[PDB]
Short mmCIF file of C-alpha atoms and ligand atoms in Angstrom, two decimals:
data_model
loop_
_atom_site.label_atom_id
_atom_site.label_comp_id
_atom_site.label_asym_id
_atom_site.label_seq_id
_atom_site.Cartn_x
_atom_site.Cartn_y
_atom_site.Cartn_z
CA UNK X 1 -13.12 3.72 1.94
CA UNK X 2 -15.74 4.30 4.58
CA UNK X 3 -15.59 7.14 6.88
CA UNK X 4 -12.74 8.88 5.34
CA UNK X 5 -11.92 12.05 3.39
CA UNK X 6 -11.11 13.32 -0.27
CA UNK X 7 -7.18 12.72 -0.31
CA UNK X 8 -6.70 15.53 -3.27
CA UNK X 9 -5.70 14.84 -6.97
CA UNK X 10 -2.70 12.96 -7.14
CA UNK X 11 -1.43 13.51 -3.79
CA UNK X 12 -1.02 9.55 -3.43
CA UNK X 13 1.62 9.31 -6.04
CA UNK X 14 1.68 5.66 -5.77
CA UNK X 15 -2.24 4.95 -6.11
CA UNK X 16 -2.60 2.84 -9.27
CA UNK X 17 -6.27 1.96 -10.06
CA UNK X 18 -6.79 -1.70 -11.99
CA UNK X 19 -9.24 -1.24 -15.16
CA UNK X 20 -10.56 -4.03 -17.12
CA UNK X 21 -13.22 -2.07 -18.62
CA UNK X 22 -13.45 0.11 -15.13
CA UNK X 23 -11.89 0.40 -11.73
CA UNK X 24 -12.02 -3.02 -10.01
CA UNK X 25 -8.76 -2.77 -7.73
CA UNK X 26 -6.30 -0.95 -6.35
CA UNK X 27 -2.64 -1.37 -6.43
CA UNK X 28 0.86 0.56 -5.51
CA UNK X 29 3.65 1.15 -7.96
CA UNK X 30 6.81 0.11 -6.48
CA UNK X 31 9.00 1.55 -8.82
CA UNK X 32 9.08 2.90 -13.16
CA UNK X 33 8.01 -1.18 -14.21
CA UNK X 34 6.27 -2.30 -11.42
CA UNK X 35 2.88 -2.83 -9.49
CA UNK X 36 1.86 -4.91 -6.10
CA UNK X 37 -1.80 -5.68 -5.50
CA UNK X 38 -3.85 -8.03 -4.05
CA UNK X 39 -3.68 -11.93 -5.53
CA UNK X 40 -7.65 -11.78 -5.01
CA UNK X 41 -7.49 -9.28 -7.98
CA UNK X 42 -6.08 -11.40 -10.25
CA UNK X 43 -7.53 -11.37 -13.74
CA UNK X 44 -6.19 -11.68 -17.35
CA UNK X 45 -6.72 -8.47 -19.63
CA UNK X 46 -5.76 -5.31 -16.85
CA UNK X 47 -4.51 -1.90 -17.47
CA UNK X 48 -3.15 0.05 -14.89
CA UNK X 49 -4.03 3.79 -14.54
CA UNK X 50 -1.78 5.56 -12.82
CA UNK X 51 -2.03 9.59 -11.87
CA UNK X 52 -6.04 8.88 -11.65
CA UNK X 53 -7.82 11.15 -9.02
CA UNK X 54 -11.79 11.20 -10.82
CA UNK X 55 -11.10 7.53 -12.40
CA UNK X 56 -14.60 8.42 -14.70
CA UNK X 57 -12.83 11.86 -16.44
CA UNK X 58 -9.57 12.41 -18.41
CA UNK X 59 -8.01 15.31 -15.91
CA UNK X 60 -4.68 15.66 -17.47
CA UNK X 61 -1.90 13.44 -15.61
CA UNK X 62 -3.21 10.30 -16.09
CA UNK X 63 -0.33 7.65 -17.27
CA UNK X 64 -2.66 3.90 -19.02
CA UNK X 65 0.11 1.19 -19.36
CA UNK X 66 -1.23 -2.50 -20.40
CA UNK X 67 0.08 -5.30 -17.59
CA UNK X 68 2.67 -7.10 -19.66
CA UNK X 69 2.50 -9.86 -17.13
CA UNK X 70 1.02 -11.18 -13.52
CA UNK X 71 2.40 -12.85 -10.63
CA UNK X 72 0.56 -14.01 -8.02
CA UNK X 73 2.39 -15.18 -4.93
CA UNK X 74 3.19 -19.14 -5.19
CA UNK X 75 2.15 -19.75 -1.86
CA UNK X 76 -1.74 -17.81 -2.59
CA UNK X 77 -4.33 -19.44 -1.02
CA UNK X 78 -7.95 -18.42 -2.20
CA UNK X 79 -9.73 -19.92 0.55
CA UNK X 80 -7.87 -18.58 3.91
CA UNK X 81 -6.58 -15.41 1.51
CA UNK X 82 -2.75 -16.47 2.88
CA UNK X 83 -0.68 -15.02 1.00
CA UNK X 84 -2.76 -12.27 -0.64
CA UNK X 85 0.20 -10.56 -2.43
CA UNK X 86 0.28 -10.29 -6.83
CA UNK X 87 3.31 -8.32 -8.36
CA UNK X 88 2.26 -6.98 -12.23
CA UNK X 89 4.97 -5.91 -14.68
CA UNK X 90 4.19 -2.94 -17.69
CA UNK X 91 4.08 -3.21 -20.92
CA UNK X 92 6.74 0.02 -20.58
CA UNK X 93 7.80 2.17 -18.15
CA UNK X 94 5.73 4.93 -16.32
CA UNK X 95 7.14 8.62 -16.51
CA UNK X 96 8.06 9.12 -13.18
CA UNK X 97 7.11 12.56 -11.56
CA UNK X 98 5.47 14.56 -8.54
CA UNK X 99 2.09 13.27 -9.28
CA UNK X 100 3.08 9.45 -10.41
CA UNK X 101 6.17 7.71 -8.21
CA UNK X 102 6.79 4.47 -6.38
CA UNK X 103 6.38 4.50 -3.40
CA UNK X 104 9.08 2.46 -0.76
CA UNK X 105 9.74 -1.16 0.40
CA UNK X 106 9.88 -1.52 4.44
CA UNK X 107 13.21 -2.93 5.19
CA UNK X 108 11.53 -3.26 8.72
CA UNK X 109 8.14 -4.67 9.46
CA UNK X 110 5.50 -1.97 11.55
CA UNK X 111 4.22 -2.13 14.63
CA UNK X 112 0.37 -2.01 15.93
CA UNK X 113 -0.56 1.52 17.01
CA UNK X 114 1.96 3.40 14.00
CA UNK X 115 -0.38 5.72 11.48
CA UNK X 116 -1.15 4.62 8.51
CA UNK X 117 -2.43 6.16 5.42
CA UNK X 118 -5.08 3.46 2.99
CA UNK X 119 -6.38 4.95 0.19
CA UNK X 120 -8.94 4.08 -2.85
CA UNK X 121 -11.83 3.92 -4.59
CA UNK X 122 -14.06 1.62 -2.93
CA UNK X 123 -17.45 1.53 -1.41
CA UNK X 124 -18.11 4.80 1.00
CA UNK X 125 -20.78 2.84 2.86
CA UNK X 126 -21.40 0.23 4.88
CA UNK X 129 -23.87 1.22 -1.98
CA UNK X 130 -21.70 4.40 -3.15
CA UNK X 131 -18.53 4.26 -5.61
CA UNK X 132 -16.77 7.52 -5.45
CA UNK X 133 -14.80 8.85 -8.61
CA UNK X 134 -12.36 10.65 -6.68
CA UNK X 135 -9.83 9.06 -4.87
CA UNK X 136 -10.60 8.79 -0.83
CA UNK X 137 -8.33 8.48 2.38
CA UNK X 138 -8.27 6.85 5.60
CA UNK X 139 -5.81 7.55 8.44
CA UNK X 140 -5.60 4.29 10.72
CA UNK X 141 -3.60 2.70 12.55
CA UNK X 142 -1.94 -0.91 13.23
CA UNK X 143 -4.01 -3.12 16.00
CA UNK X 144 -2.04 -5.33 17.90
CA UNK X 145 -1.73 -8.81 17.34
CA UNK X 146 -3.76 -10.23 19.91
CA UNK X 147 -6.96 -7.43 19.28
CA UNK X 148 -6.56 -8.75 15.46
CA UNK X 149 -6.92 -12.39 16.15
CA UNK X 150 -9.38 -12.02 18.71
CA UNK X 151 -11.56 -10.31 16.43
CA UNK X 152 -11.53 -12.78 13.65
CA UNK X 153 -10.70 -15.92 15.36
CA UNK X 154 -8.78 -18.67 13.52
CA UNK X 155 -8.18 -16.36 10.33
CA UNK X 156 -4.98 -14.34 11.06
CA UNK X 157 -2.04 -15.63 9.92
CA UNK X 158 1.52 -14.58 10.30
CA UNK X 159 0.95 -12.78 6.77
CA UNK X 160 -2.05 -10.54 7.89
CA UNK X 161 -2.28 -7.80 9.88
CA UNK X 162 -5.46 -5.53 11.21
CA UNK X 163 -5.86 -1.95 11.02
CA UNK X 164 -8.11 0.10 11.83
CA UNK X 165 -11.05 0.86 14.38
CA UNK X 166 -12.88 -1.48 16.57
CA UNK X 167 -15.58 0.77 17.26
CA UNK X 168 -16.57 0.70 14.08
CA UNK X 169 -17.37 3.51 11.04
CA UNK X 170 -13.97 4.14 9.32
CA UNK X 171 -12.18 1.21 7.18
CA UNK X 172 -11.49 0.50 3.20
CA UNK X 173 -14.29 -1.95 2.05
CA UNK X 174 -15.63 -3.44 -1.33
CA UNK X 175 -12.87 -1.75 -4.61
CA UNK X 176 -10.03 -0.42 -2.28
CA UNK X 177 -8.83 -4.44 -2.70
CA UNK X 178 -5.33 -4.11 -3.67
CA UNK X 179 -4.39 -0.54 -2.74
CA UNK X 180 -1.86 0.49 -0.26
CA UNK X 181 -1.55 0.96 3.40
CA UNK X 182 1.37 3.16 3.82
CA UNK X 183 2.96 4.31 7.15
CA UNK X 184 5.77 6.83 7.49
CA UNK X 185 6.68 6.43 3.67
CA UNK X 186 6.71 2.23 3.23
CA UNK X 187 4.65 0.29 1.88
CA UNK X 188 3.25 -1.16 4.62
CA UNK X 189 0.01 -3.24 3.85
CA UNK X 190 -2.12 -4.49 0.82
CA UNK X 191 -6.11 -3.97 1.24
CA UNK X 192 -7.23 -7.70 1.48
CA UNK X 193 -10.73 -8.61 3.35
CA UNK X 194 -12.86 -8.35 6.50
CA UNK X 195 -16.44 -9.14 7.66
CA UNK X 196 -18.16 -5.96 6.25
CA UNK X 197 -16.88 -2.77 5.94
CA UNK X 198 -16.65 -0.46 9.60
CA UNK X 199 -18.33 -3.15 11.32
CA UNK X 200 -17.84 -2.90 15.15
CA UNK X 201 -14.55 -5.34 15.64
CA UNK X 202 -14.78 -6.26 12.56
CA UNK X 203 -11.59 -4.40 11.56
CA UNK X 204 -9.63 -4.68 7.92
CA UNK X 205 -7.15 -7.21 7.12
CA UNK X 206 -4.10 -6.61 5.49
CA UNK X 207 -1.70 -8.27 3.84
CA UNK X 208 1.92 -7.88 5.67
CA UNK X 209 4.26 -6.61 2.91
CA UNK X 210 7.25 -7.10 4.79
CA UNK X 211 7.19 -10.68 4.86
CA UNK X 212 7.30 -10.47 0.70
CA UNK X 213 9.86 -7.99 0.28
CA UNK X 214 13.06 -10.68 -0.66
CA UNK X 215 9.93 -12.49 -3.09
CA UNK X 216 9.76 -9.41 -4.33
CA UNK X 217 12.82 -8.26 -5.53
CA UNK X 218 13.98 -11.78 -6.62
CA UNK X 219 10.91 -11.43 -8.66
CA UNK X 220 12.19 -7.91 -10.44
CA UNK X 221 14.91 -9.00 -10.55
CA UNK X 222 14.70 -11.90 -12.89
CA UNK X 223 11.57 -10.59 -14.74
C1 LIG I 1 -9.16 -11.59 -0.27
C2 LIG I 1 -10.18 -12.13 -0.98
C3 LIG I 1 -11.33 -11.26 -1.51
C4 LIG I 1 -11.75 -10.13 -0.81
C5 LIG I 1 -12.78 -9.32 -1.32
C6 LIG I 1 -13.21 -8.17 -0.43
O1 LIG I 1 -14.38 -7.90 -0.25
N1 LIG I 1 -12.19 -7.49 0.25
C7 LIG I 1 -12.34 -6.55 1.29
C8 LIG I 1 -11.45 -5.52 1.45
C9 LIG I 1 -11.53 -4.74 2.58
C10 LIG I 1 -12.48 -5.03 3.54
C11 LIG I 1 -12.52 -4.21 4.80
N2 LIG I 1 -11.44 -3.60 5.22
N3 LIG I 1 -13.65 -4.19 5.60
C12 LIG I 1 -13.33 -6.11 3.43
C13 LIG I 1 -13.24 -6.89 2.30
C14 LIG I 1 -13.43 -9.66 -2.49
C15 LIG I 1 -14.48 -8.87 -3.02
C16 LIG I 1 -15.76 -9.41 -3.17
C17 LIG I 1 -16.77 -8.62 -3.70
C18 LIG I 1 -16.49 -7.32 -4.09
C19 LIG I 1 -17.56 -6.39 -4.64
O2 LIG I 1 -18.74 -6.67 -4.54
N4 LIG I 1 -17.13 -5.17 -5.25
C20 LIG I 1 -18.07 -4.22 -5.76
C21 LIG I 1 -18.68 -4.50 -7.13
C22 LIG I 1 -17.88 -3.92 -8.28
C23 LIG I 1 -17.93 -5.43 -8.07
N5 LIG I 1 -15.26 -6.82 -3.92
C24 LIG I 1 -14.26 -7.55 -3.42
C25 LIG I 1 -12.91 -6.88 -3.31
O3 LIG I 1 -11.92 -7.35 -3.96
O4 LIG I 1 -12.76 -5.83 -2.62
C26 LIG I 1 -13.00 -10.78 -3.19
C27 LIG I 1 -11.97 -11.59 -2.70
O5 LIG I 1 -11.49 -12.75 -3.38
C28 LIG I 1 -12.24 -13.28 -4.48
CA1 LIG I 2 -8.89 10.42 -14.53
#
């Protein structure tokens, strides 16, 4: 996250970091069994850490469940990042408290200019991993400002959020986490040219498009 602020230990219940060895994604538990992330951070071998704030030290609420299994959307496309949307079961089931809970599905899709809250441990500049896990308020940009600012690219599974001036966006390591607005799960952390780059805002993947994949997919795994 670039051009953000500390969030405070554990106060993004949801906030899973992906560790393969160390923090390489984020992700958002969705409910005691579940994870969504990014299909970009697809890779055999991941254990999810959930209650992390400093992902480097043991602080005390920490929950480290093995993935049991991925799924990355059927319809993921690598090249144009359609699609960007990977559901990962645990091996068992988190202990669900103040400082680790899912965090809800939209039953309606969001509009550009609604608030949003993205969250992780990416890249602070446009080189600087922080161990503590960082915020970003921003919000929704219209339709029209996100496909004129990466023309060609935006499909109806994308949306951009953010600023076009420039200075505040996720970037590099926040791949995965969650954009959340007024208590849904609202986004996935996907790509964009850069991080804070002058209308070069961040694309998202639109979770409300996958929420009947979704629960068809709990539902029979
Ligand atoms: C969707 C495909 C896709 C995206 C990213 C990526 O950049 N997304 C990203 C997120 C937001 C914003 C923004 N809002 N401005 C911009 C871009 C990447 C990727 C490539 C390189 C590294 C890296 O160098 N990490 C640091 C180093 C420890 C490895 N990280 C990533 C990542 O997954 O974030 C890899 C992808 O498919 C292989
Ligand atoms: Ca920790």
């Amino acid at each position: 996250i670039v051009g953000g602020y500390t969030c405070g230990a554990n106060t993004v219940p949801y906030q899973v970091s992906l560790n393969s060895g160390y923090h390489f994604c984020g992700g958002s538990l969705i409910n005691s069994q579940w994870v969504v992330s990014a299909a970009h951070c697809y890779k055999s071998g991941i254990q999810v850490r959930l209650g992390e704030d400093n992902i480097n030290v043991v602080e005390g609420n920490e929950q480290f469940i093995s993935a049991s299994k991925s799924i990355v959307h059927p319809s993921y496309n690598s090249n144009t990042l359609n699609n960007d949307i990977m559901l990962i079961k645990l091996k068992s089931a988190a202990s669900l408290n103040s400082r680790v809970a899912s965090i809800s599905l939209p039953t309606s899709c969001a509009s550009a200019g609604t608030q949003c809250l993205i969250s992780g441990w990416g890249n602070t500049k446009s080189t600087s991993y922080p161990d503590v896990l960082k915020c970003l308020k921003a919000p929704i940009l219209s339709d029209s400002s996100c496909k004129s600012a990466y023309p060609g690219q935006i499909t109806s599974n994308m949306f951009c959020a953010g600023y076009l001036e420039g200075g505040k966006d996720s970037c590099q390591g926040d791949s995965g986490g969650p954009v959340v607005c007024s208590g849904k799960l609202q986004g996935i952390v996907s790509w964009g040219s850069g991080c804070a780059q002058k209308n070069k805002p961040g694309v998202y993947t639109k979770v409300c498009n996958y929420v009947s994949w979704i629960k068809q997919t709990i539902a029979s795994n």
